[PDB]
């Protein structure tokens, strides 16, 4: 009767609904009883300190468990042959075959083999022993405590910031661009120049000696002379053995381009010069806005002045500054959309240009990292649109936004939704039509009648960057072009070698199968966008429920009248787009993984021939690669892939259980629960025990959420088991 | 493994005692009127 202390409507619910709804609404502080804006911003600030401390504890824990139980020192000697250890296993349910089967890694105890890539990352940035992994774990534990204390401190009465501080956009932007982005990029350049690069060249540099060991032989004198090019002289030779002095140069800031030939990773001096240049550019970016000394820009003035004189945007961006500063949901939507694009860039650029030494030879790690960050990207991208819908319902004021870009979006929302519906159908009809055409024609024994479109536009873009595989001879591929000649002194010799060796994932060769799957991805992106955009733009009202904004973001329906109004809320369009996000990331990661495992065998023609019809995807990807996974245990024994084999089935179970919440609805279950309530009250020796909360069926929205969570969890667990076990079992 | 007794001490406590204690005290807290 007092658990939802933030909600008097829930704390007086006499059913089990009070516990569920009180737990699911706990972090939505705007809706809690008696919430002011002052108290809202101060609780958000403190719970951001708590989240930061959670991230530092997670990193310290990974470092500690590798320092304690891993084989980092054995792996560092021979990184292509040793398998990295994540943590040890202590499970009293194990049998002796299981204990023996998981005793890999060169140690005497069962272990999980790490797919996170943290060994390659810590190796590349300097770590060599277990004791500096342990030193780093103690530092992160201290930082976690410092940020827990800072969160507690800024909730104390004198240290609680005012709303004027929280809405000083100009100062925050100056400090976050020049200090949080720019200065820390400059300091990371310093770490690479002072520690990581010397330890890539055999010389140990730590806190005990780093003030008496110069990164460069000349040493901070060419910098103070303008002879900056003296820091690029004598780079690492192509004979350099990473971690050792053999083949090593003395340069600290180079622009060689391409990959270190032995680690198959980007040069560390390129990475150091990248972070130096990024640091300088972002520090310059952080002097744009006016804080206290009269130079700089007012953000309000820039938004107010950008109205095109032709009048096509209406009043332009007048009043947008007020709405963005006041609305935290608008800020969340922008931050999540922006973050989602970056984690997709992270996934795409780290498989094609790997930065960690000896990575890209570990296929399980490459597959796991790509899959992980694309799934994070899809979640962030859905959340951005969800909080844009919450913005329109909750924070959008039509009288402060008269004839804005925002109001004019709502003025032609029907045009945007109808055009998105057209493009999705135009892509869907023809992509499914070409795939089904190829399927029937191959099935009837005639694959030469397939519709195989060459992806010439993307091949032309590859050739423009120097790929000499399609004979297009454009730009960098053309030896005598203004583009090729301009960069001949610097990046072009190294980059051309990297992009024209067929031994990496820089600009992978493409054909008709890549054309068809790129069009399927485009259809999935448009359809997921259609549901999310339709949800945001119809959030305030529609023709069925024109007063939809009075009811909120998440409500079950408007009842059976007017034809029926199930799934009419903007929350329900988040719900429907979550299935399409899962489908989209499914098509993307299935494509990445099949193309990469076929290249890793040397059998790229298996993808080239089987990807143009859907039976090739069914038998040559799912069915063919299932066999090491589903044989992880069998009546003849078990091996260390048994755990993924169990997780695979576990994933199939949760997913199917989600169907029960999504197909069967509340009225059935409430009538069952009433027969069980009767039976408990009438059964002797059991009616001595009484519920404090009346058992009720889950709510309509809660059941949609429970089915979505089960569906999504089953999706993630099944694919994770397949992508790790098939790559491990095959090793290629 | 160094301090090898630690998994055999901490895993039963973290996996059984810690949830049994939070379930018991959360149950008491969520079902009190005051």
């Amino acid at each position: 009767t007092k658990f939802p202390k933030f909600s008097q409507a829930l704390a007086q619910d006499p059913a089990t609904r009070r516990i569920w709804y009180g737990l699911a609404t706990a972090h939505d502080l705007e809706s809690h009883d008696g919430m002011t804006e002052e108290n809202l911003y101060q609780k958000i600030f403190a719970s951001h300190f708590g989240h930061l401390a959670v991230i530092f504890l997670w990193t310290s824990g990974n470092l500690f468990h590798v320092a304690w139980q891993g084989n980092f020192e054995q792996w560092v000697l021979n990184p292509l042959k040793v398998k990295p250890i994540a943590h040890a296993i202590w499970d009293p349910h194990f049998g002796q075959p299981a204990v023996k089967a998981f005793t890999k890694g060169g140690v005497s105890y069962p272990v999980n083999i790490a797919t996170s890539g943290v060994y390659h990352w810590w190796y590349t940035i300097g770590m060599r022993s277990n004791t500096d992994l342990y030193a780093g774990s103690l530092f992160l534990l201290f930082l976690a405590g410092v940020f827990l204390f800072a969160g507690w401190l800024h909730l104390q009465p004198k240290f609680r910031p005012g709303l004027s501080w929280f809405k000083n956009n100009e100062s925050r932007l100056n400090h976050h661009l020049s200090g949080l982005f720019g200065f820390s990029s400059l300091a990371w350049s310093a770490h690479l120049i002072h520690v990581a690069i010397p330890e890539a060249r055999g010389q140990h540099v730590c806190w005990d000696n780093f003030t008496k060991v110069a990164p460069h032989p000349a040493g901070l004198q060419p910098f103070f002379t303008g002879n900056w090019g003296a820091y690029a002289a004598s780079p690492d030779t192509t004979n350099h053995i990473f971690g050792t002095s053999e083949g090593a140069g003395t340069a600290i800031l180079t622009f060689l381009g391409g990959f270190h030939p032995q680690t198959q990773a980007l040069w560390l001096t390129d990475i150091a010069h990248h972070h130096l240049a990024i640091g300088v550019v972002f520090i310059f970016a952080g002097h744009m806005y006016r804080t206290n000394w009269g130079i700089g820009h007012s953000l309000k003035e820039i938004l107010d002045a950008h109205r095109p004189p032709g009048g096509r945007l209406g009043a332009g961006h007048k009043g947008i500054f007020e709405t963005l500063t006041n609305s935290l949901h608008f800020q969340l939507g922008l931050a999540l959309a922006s973050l989602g694009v970056i984690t997709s860039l992270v996934a795409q650029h780290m498989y094609a240009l790997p930065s960690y030494a000896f990575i890209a030879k570990d296929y399980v790690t490459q597959s796991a990292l790509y899959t992980h960050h694309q799934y994070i990207a899809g979640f962030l991208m859905v959340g951005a649109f969800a909080h844009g819908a919450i913005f329109f319902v909750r924070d959008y004021d039509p009288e402060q936004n008269k004839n804005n870009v925002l109001a004019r979006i709502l003025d032609h929302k029907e045009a945007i939704i109808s055009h998105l519906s057209w493009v999705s159908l135009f892509l869907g009809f023809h992509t499914l039509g070409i795939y089904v055409h190829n399927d029937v024609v191959v099935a009837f024994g005639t694959p030469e009648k397939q519709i195989l479109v060459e992806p010439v536009f993307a091949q032309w873009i590859q050739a423009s960057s120097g790929k000499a595989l399609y004979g297009f001879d454009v730009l960098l591929s053309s030896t005598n072009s203004v583009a090729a000649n301009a960069s001949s002194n610097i990046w072009l010799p190294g980059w051309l070698e990297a992009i024209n060796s067929g031994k990496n994932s820089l600009f992978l060769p493409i054909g008709p199968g890549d054309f068809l799957i790129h069009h399927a991805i485009a259809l999935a992106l448009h359809t997921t966008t259609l549901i999310l955009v339709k949800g945001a733009l119809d959030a305030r009202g529609s023709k069925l429920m024109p007063d939809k904004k009075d009811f909120g973001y998440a409500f079950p329906c408007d009842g059976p009248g007017r034809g029926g109004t199930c799934d009419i809320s903007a929350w329900d369009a988040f719900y429907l787009s979550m299935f399409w996000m899962l489908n989209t990331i499914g098509w993307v990661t299935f494509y990445w993984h099949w193309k990469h495992i076929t290249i890793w065998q040397g059998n790229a023609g298996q993808f080239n021939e089987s990807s143009t019809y859907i039976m090739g995807w069914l038998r040559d990807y799912l069915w063919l690669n299932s066999s090491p996974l589903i044989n992880g245990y069998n009546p003849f024994g078990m091996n260390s892939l048994s755990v993924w084999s169990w997780m695979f089935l576990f994933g199939h179970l949760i997913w199917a259980t989600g169907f029960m919440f999504l197909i069967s609805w509340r009225g059935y279950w409430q009538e069952l629960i009433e027969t069980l309530v009767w039976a408990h009250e009438r059964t002797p020796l059991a009616n001595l025990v009484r519920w404090k909360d009346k058992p009720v069926a889950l709510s309509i929205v809660q059941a949609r959420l429970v089915g979505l969570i089960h569906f999504t969890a089953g999706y993630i667990f099944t694919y994770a088991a397949f992508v790790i076990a098939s790559t491990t079992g095959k090793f290629g | 493994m160094t301090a090898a007794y630690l998994p055999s001490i901490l895993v039963p406590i973290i996996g059984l005692i810690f949830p049994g204690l939070v379930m018991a005290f959360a149950f008491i807290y969520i079902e009190q009127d005051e």
């Binding site: 401390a53 277990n130 103690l138 405590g145 827990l148 | 160094t2």
Partner: peptide, 30 residues
């Protein structure tokens, strides 16, 4: 390798972090 005493140093600092986590959580809870 890591000694047990080093593990005990890690457990002390993680205990201090647990106490600060409780105090921040109680401040957030009010």
């Amino acid at each position: 390798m890591i000694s047990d005493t080093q593990i005990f140093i890690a457990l002390i600092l993680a205990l201090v972090s647990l106490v600060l986590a409780i105090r921040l959580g109680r401040a957030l809870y009010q």
